[PDB]
Write a protein that binds this ligand. Structure first.
Ligand SMILES: NC(=O)c1ccc[n+]([C@@H]2O[C@H](COP(=O)([O-])OP(=O)(O)OC[C@H]3O[C@@H](n4cnc5c(N)ncnc54)[C@H](OP(=O)(O)O)[C@@H]3O)[C@@H](O)[C@H]2O)c1
Length: 357
């Protein structure tokens, strides 16, 4: 009845020589009183995994954000979950004070309340594809100053004059979850991405979608939005996406939010960027002197977000990004990361269903 974690496990990490490495003698985490122990069944690959390298990498700390798995033990201070339940959530990868916690392990623990039970109708693979998307979508809306959806409302809030939100990179894993959430809160997303993903973008909430390569496209968008676009969410964050977003924003100003720190005007634009670890209310060691401290308000926001998003996912109002599923082990995760780093996925999320053993 007391739970004793296995003596060692396989986990994906980074070397002393900055190489991604399968480690077959990695530690297993201890079980917090307020968390559950998870045998990991599926994981999703995120670009942020592939950037944990150089001095962003903590050698021997576990990689990986998105996991879904089977509860094999339950903390003493936890009710409503039992052994055998299925959960999905986010880990805080490569955190130096919790090196034995990451999605890319055979055994992990839930973190904070940034997790939920998998609805009866979803697979481990569908559920694993969700966590970073949900967490980022909520953090982006928070930064933009937009209320999260009500899980109990019968329709989105009404706006006789549309409130537009530009989503640059409409086929990104983050944008497809975010656009559904924006629609639920009564906003009208307009998206830019490649033509082969137009159907995908519209299916996920874009009123209209445009090829970002199209000449003078920001004039088109300005006109579409009656020269009063006040919100832009940049899911790409490079020199070109930033220029484009600034150009599309209306003459009276607006708010630009990016998913990464943005590259090296007088235009009346407020700016923010999503810091992923803040979903846990934990803080970080960048950027870049002092990092950011943790905070109970950030902690409570992530818990509120996950309670809301967990229900939306439960009732079919929030759907996962299209999947590319690989059956395999930790080498398949490492191969997965290379595919993602090389920019080789479009309109799909790479999910590894773990063959145990
Ligand atoms: N700070 C955080 O915690 C956090 C969280 C989530 C994401 N992010 C960052 O956000 C970015 C997106 O990640 P994600 O997982 O949401 O997306 P993703 O699924 O990896 O996005 C891939 C898509 O980006 C588009 N694309 C790639 N390069 C582009 C370019 N130069 N210009 C226009 N479109 C481009 C392609 O779309 P088309 O083929 O349709 O053109 C491709 O389908 C990554 O940089 C990631 O590191 C950060």
């Amino acid at each position: 009845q007391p739970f004793i974690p296995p003596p060692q496990q396989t986990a994906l990490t980074v070397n002393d020589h900055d190489e991604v490495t399968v480690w077959n003698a990695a530690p297993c985490p201890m079980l917090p009183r307020d968390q559950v122990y998870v045998r990991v069944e599926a994981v999703a690959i995120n670009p942020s995994d592939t950037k944990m390298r150089g001095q962003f990498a903590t050698p021997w700390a576990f990689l990986g954000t998105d996991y879904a798995g089977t509860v094999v033990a339950v903390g003493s201070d936890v009710t409503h979950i039992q052994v055998g339940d299925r959960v999905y959530g986010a880990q805080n990868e490569m955190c130096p004070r919790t090196p034995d916690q990451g999605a890319f392990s055979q055994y992990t623990v839930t973190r904070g309340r940034v997790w939920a039970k998998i609805p009866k109708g979803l697979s481990f693979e569908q559920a694993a594809a969700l966590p970073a998307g949900i967490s980022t979508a909520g953090l982006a809306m928070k930064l933009l100053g937009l209320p999260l959806p009500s899980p109990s409302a019968d329709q989105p809030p009404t706006h006789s004059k549309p409130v537009y939100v530009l989503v640059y990179g409409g086929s990104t894993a983050t944008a497809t979850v975010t656009m559904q959430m924006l629609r639920l809160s009564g906003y009208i997303p307009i998206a830019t991405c490649s033509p082969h993903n137009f159907d995908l973008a519209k299916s996920r909430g874009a009123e209209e979608v445009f090829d970002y390569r199209a000449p003078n496209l920001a004039q088109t968008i300005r006109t579409y939005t009656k020269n009063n676009l006040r919100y832009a969410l940049d899911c790409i964050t490079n020199v070109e996406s930033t220029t484009f977003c600034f150009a599309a924003i209306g003459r009276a100003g607006g708010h630009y939010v990016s998913l990464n720190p943005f590259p090296e005007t007088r235009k009346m634009v407020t700016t923010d960027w999503t810091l992923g670890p803040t979903i846990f209310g934990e803080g970080s060691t960048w950027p870049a002197p002092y990092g950011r401290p943790g905070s109970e308000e950030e902690r409570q926001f992530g818990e509120d977000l996950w309670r809301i998003a967990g229900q939306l996912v439960e009732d079919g109002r929030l759907v996962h990004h299209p999947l590319r599923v690989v059956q395999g082990g930790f080498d398949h995760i490492k191969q997965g990361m290379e595919l993602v780093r090389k920019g080789e996925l479009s309109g799909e999320k790479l999910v590894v269903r773990l063959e145990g053993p």
